[PDB]
Amino acid sequence: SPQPLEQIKLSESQLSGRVGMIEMDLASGRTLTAWRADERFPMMSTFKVVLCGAVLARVDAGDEQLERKIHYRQQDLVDYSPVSEKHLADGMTVGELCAAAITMSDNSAANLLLATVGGPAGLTAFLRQIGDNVTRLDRWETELNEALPGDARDTTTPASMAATLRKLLTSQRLSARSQRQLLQWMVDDRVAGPLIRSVLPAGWFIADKTGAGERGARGIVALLGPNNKAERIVVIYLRDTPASMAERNQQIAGIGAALIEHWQR
Ligand SMILES: OC[C@H]1O[C@H](O[C@H]2[C@H](O)[C@@H](O)[C@H](OCCCCCCC3CCCCC3)O[C@@H]2CO)[C@H](O)[C@@H](O)[C@@H]1O
Numbered sequence: 001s002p003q004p005l006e007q008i009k010l011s012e013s014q015l016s017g018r019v020g021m022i023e024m025d026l027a028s029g030r031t032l033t034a035w036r037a038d039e040r041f042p043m044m045s046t047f048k049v050v051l052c053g054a055v056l057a058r059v060d061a062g063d064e065q066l067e068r069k070i071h072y073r074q075q076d077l078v079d080y081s082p083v084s085e086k087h088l089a090d091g092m093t094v095g096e097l098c099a100a101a102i103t104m105s106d107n108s109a110a111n112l113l114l115a116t117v118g119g120p121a122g123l124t125a126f127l128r129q130i131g132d133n134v135t136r137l138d139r140w141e142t143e144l145n146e147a148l149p150g151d152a153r154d155t156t157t158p159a160s161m162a163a164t165l166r167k168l169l170t171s172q173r174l175s176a177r178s179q180r181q182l183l184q185w186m187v188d189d190r191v192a193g194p195l196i197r198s199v200l201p202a203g204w205f206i207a208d209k210t211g212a213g214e215r216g217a218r219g220i221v222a223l224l225g226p227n228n229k230a231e232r233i234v235v236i237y238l239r240d241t242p243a244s245m246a247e248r249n250q251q252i253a254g255i256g257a258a259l260i261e262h263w264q265r
């Protein structure tokens with residue numbers, strides 16, 4: 001594989017779409033690679049990690065408990081609720097809802113949690129409170145991944161998302177236990193985690209949350225590194241490409257291959 005930047009450019013050429021990417025040291029925030037890092041991209045399901053960061057902040061403040069059981073109704077369910085549709089009778093705890101939202105991308109779980117933090121406006125206010133003045137959530141699942149061309153709703157930038165994830169995972173804004181919980185939910189991703197491990201060379205750590213939307217929108221927010229360590233945050237978003245999901249996945253994987261082959265930078 002060629003150098004990361006060369007590969008990213010090649011991916012735009014092949015997809016006919018825009019790619020946004022940041023590679024950042026998790027411990028220090030050092031930015032290693034930045035491409036269209038200040039341009040907007042739909043967050044799609046990647047917003048679920050930020051959502052649960054807001055939930056954990058409420059737990060730390062004593063305003064929420066991960067144990068608290070939420071009971072909901074069938075009429076509350078939206079498209080794609082693999083975990084939540086199974087608990088209409090017994091409900092789910094707030095912690096279970098975050099696990100379902102992050103590890104299974106359960107949309108109803110995400111909407112139930114979104115309501116607890118004040119909806120899209122409440123989550124956006126949380127982002128402003130931690131210093132992210134760019135990322136914004138405007139809608140609920142599943143309308144939020146519509147990805148209309150030029151629509152600023154429900155978007156982030158690679159730089160903002162990377163900085164925000166680092167703040168949630170390491171800045172001590174969240175308690176030690178909460179930081180560890182957010183990380184573990186990403187490590188436990190069932191949608192792409194196992195698949196990514198199956199193609200990663202031995203020794204490479206992966207934790208992640210993916211997203212998909214209309215007009216080719218696709219993305220991933222991840223922790224990656226050799227020697228089984230979460231060394232870097234890697235955020236990659238794609239938008240406005242007519243390519244098959246398989247090809248969008250392959251191009252993102254190709255950027256990862258370039259990082260892996262040329263890690264020491
Ligand atoms: O010399 C480095 C490595 O080169 C190859 O590894 C390949 C691997 O066989 C392939 O499957 C993967 O594809 C990349 C798979 C990446 C999947 C997702 C990455 C995510 C992670 C972070 C966010 C964005 C994307 O590339 C590597 C590097 O070329 C060799 O197979 C391996 O033995 C060797 O150690």
Ligand SMILES: *C(=O)/C=C/N[C@@H](C(=O)O)[C@](C)(COC(=O)CCCC(=O)O)S(=O)O
Nearest residue numbers: 044045046080105142145191210211212213
């Ligand atoms: C989050 O990104 C969700 C995107 N797509 C879903 C949606 O529009 O709500 C789908 C229902 C597909 O969902 C999945 O394929 C599961 C994994 C979603 C993820 O990557 O987080 S829609 O068909 O696009």
